[PDB]
Amino acid sequence: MATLEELDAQTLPGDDELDQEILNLSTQELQTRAKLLDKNNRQLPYLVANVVEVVGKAAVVKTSSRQTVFLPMVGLVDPDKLKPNDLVGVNKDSYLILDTLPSEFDSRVKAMEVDEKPTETYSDVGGLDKQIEELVEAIVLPMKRAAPKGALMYGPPGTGKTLLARACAAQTNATFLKLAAPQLVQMYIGEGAKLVRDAFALAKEKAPTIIFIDELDAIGTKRFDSEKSGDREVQRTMLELLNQLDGFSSDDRVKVLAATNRVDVLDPALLRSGRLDRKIEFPLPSEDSRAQILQIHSRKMTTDDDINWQELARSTDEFNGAQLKAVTVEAGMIALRNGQSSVKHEDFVEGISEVQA
Amino acid sequence: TKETVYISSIALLKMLKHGRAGVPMEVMGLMLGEFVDDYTVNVVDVFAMPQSGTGVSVEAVDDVFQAKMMDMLKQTGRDQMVVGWYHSHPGFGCWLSSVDVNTQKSFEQLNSRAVAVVVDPIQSVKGKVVI
Amino acid sequence: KLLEHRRYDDQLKQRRQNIRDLEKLYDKTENDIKALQSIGQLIGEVMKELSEEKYIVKASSGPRYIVGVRNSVDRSKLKKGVRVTLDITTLTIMRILPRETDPLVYNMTSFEQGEITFDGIGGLTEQIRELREVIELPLKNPEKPPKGVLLYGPPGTGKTLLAKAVAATIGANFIFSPASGIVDKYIGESARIIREMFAYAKEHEPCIIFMDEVDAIGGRRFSEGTSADREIQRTLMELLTQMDGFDNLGQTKIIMATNRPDTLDPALLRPGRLDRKVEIPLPNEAGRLEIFKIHTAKVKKTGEFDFEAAVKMSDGFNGADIRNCATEAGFFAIRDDRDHINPDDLMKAVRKVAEVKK
């Protein structure tokens, strides 16, 4: 019964061989692994380049010095990492791509402004809980279940359209992106498109995202006609996002939320599942909707309770929230201008009194 | 001052081959030969250092592989003095590097004297030689 | 006594298995380790062939050069513009290369055939059939070839889908062409972008070309003066010089896109350029109803999901606005806790789809 003992005790050294034999085999390249790669790597930084072919082993790239080179697709790189529009550690002299280079000091377009999923609630600007539901209906509910890629805002901000976005950006916990249409209107052909393209990816990098467009009517113009030479941008940049909207539906990670006082053009694109689905108002909220904001404003002032919001709220009229706060910060200001640390109705009526128009 | 360098065209072409393809890099490695009395720079051989992903340097010299060879070369019966330094200097008449100098300079230490061989493998290919 | 049998195999099994565990990596890395020997290779697209060998290839990275072939070189294939790998030293061909002269998926945008066949957007059926017999068949029925086919009417009625419905059934590669971006401020960039739509596609044929809502680089321009309109007229003429020029559509077909056709060059509207001018109206009530039980009912839905009352509450819904009957109720599906759209989901949607519009 003890034979297979010896027998497989005799296999063991012959067994031991292979691994041990390989442990020899191991080191061998492990060096040349390291050695070259080590030799090889890296410089800070390389010129990067953009692939064309990925036959199956073939790639050409064109440098950050603008130089087209073929190479058999190099070792440190992967065919999926391999791609046009790419950062690559590339031996410049050899035009040998050394490294792939990742998302990196790559342009975020410093001009572009990202607010990642800012924690905000719907108690930011009060009395807007109306479309705060429509938000949830167009954003939260589409997000958390399985749908639009975003909703069309309209209505004057200062009502905190952005806040409700950023509320949704906390609420859905989706990446908020407010990128100024000031950045999107371009002297360069389809650059805002590129900007929308970067923002598309860069925010989708951070998706779930709520992309917050500032006054869509900036790029909300395709005009009517064949004159598009003069402004392609406002059109084409818009057209860029549209096809990026036309590019998904079921992504509720991306929420493209276009804020206007009111949007200009309206396309079944502009209200669409997969494009902006929901045209969403943010008018200057009602009187004690604003007292609700005036609350949020008269909130953090130390006060004597002369305050009566509704009087303020009726005597003030149609404030985008901060005008109440204009009233309010005046009130606080006027509270010391009334000598009080307490901020009172008079402070606020003098917050009214500083001309509210 | 009028000094007699002597090359194995083998080593010459060996370098060339190595150097011709070496573009961009200056090719690097041993230079096998001796000095017969003075003036006399003999070359039987040479060889690539393997690619330097660190490029030509006093550092990128690895004397491991030489010995490996040199052994196998000693095994081959192949043995010489390492007589200096030969690299591929694209579009370079000029001079190679003070580095390369220092590189060599560190190394010609190991001899009475050495070389750093200028090569433009570009300008070499002309049907005449550049070196 | 016999516990060793394990400890034999135990080691062994792993060991004998651990063999190629360690092992495979070497070669792969070794390949890389080797791939590092390999070095990059300069590129050009021949600026021209002086003689069979003699090439002006302006460096794809830089200026013009007098260069020869090298080897594995077809001085035949070698021509002006021919993409070639070039030498760092010999400065000649290191290889001949298949060209991509144009962001075939960006400036050009290429898709093999189309997503859906004709039918799903049925209720657009007028252009379902008639186009195919003027598009797909005359391909397979080369006995004119179709010059162009001009889509117009509201998009995304299936209009958006119609172009690909055309592409799907044919076998061609649908190539989307947006308008404005093709005219860069320069000459022939348009043509360049367009002629690769000619080059790649006619090389890649069968290819559907789709020129998106083009009043920008085409059509009747601004004053038909110079806004860069002359760049636009170029494009307008480029297609003209492709279409009223002898470039045919052999298997590479061109789907024109506009919402309204009359915003375009009448010379384009002529045969030799446009063989077809495609209205694409809304889905009818039944046009919806057909599209409905296609575009909507295919979304997971109850029988309870109210089929025609949606269609009845569906008023002038496009193929997508049909899907909104589904999808706006996909909210209420999601909201009624449905993956399967239910009547409650539904008629909320179709009203919601018919609330904002007709």
Swiss-Prot record, chain A:
Q: Which UniProt keywords apply?
A: Acetylation, ATP-binding, Cytoplasm, Nucleotide-binding, Nucleus, Phosphoprotein, Proteasome
* Alphabetical list of Pfam families matching this protein: AAA, AAA_lid_3, Prot_ATP_ID_OB_C
Q: Which residues carry this modification: Phosphotyrosine?
A: 122
GO MF annotations for this entry? ATP binding; ATP hydrolysis activity; proteasome-activating activity
**N-acetylalanine-modified residues are where?**
2
- Going by the entry's taxonomy, the superkingdom of the source organism is recorded as Eukaryota
The record's account of how the chain is modified after translation: N-acetylated by NAT1.
For biological process, the GO terms are: positive regulation of RNA polymerase II transcription preinitiation complex assembly; proteasome regulatory particle assembly; proteasome-mediated ubiquitin-dependent protein catabolic process; ubiquitin-dependent protein catabolic process
Q: Where in the cell is it found?
A: Cytoplasm; Nucleus
Tell me which residues bind ATP. 155-162
Q: For this UniProt entry, what's an example GO CC term? A: proteasome regulatory particle, base subcomplex
The record ties this protein, via PANTHER family, to: 26S PROTEASOME REGULATORY SUBUNIT
Give the family this protein belongs to, as stated in its UniProt record.
Answer: Belongs to the AAA ATPase family.
Protein function: The 26S proteasome is involved in the ATP-dependent degradation of ubiquitinated proteins. The regulatory (or ATPase) complex confers ATP dependency and substrate specificity to the 26S complex.
State the name under which the record lists this protein: 26S proteasome regulatory subunit 6A
Swiss-Prot record, chain B:
What does the protein in this record do? Component of the lid subcomplex of the 26S proteasome, a multiprotein complex involved in the ATP-dependent degradation of ubiquitinated proteins. RPN11 is the only catalytically active member of the lid and serves as the essential deubiquitinase of the proteasome.
Question: Domain remarks in the entry?
Answer: The JAMM motif is required for the deubiquitination and degradation of ubiquitinated substrates.
Where is Zn(2+) bound in this sequence?
87, 89, 100
Counting on the full-length protein, the chain here runs from 23 to 153 of 306
Query: Out of the domains of life, which is the source?
Result: Eukaryota
- Print the miscellaneous field: Present with 16400 molecules/cell in log phase SD medium.
Q: Which family does it belong to?
A: Belongs to the peptidase M67A family.
List where the protein spans the membrane.
none
Q: Give all residue intervals belonging to the MPN domain.
A: 5-131
Motif JAMM motif: where? 87-100
Its signal peptide is none
Protein's recorded name: Ubiquitin carboxyl-terminal hydrolase RPN11
Please name every pair of cysteines joined by a disulfide bond in this record. none
Description of post-translational modifications: N-acetylated by NAT3.
Instruction: Describe the protein's quaternary organization and the partners it interacts with.
Output: Component of the lid subcomplex of the 19S proteasome regulatory particle complex (also named PA700 complex). The 26S proteasome consists of a 20S proteasome core and two 19S regulatory subunits. Interacts directly with RPN8 and STS1.
From which organism does this entry originate?
A: Saccharomyces cerevisiae (strain ATCC 204508 / S288c) (Baker's yeast)
Swiss-Prot record, chain C:
Entry keyword annotation includes Zinc = no
- The SS bond pairs are none
Q: How is it modified after translation?
A: N-acetylated by NAT1.
GO terms for molecular function, please? ATP binding; ATP hydrolysis activity; proteasome-activating activity; protein domain specific binding; ubiquitin protein ligase binding
Q: Which residues make up the binding site for ATP? A: 153-160
BP-aspect Gene Ontology terms = ERAD pathway; nucleotide-excision repair; positive regulation of RNA polymerase II transcription preinitiation complex assembly; positive regulation of transcription elongation by RNA polymerase II; proteasome regulatory particle assembly; proteasome-mediated ubiquitin-dependent protein catabolic process
Which keywords appear in this protein's UniProt record, sorted alphabetically? Answer: Acetylation, ATP-binding, Nucleotide-binding, Proteasome
Q: Flavoprotein: present as a keyword of the record?
A: no
GO CC terms: nucleus; proteasome complex; proteasome regulatory particle, base subcomplex
Q: Which family does it belong to?
A: Belongs to the AAA ATPase family.
Quote the function comment for this protein.
Answer: The 26S proteasome is involved in the ATP-dependent degradation of ubiquitinated proteins. The regulatory (or ATPase) complex confers ATP dependency and substrate specificity to the 26S complex.
What name does UniProt use for this protein? 26S proteasome subunit RPT4
Organism per entry: Saccharomyces cerevisiae (strain ATCC 204508 / S288c)
Whole-protein residues included: 63 to 427 of 437
